[PDB]
């Protein structure tokens, strides 16, 4: 799937954890409850972007990383823009204020079960 900055926080039953410390078999919170981490991939340096929401939430992801919106999943390469809304916990729409290009950063991909979604920095994201 996509890739997210190493320090991105995901919600486990035992508390928030940085995604670089997530292991296969961990549980991560989604909009439906907890999905299981089915796989992790090696971190790698990738061109990255920062999405900043109107409520101050920020997430750093790859250009093709998919984000649920009210009109369907979208990524930055496929035309996710400032002025559109993402879902924050719990399923509250929040406007994207800025999308900025952040140069090369270490990003990491995890894959989860179920609806393949999980909250990342409290923003609902796709695998």
Residue numbers in the entry: -1 to 125
Quote the authors verbatim:
Protein splicing is catalyzed by intervening protein sequences termed inteins. The protein-splicing reaction involves the self-removal of the intein and concomitant joining of the two flanking sequences (exteins). All splicing domains found among inteins have the same structural architecture named HINT (Hedgehog/INTein) which relates to the C-terminal domain of the Hedgehog protein (Hh–C or hog domain). Instead of the N-terminal serine or cysteine missing among class 3 inteins, class 3 inteins contain an additional nucleophilic cysteine residue in block F.
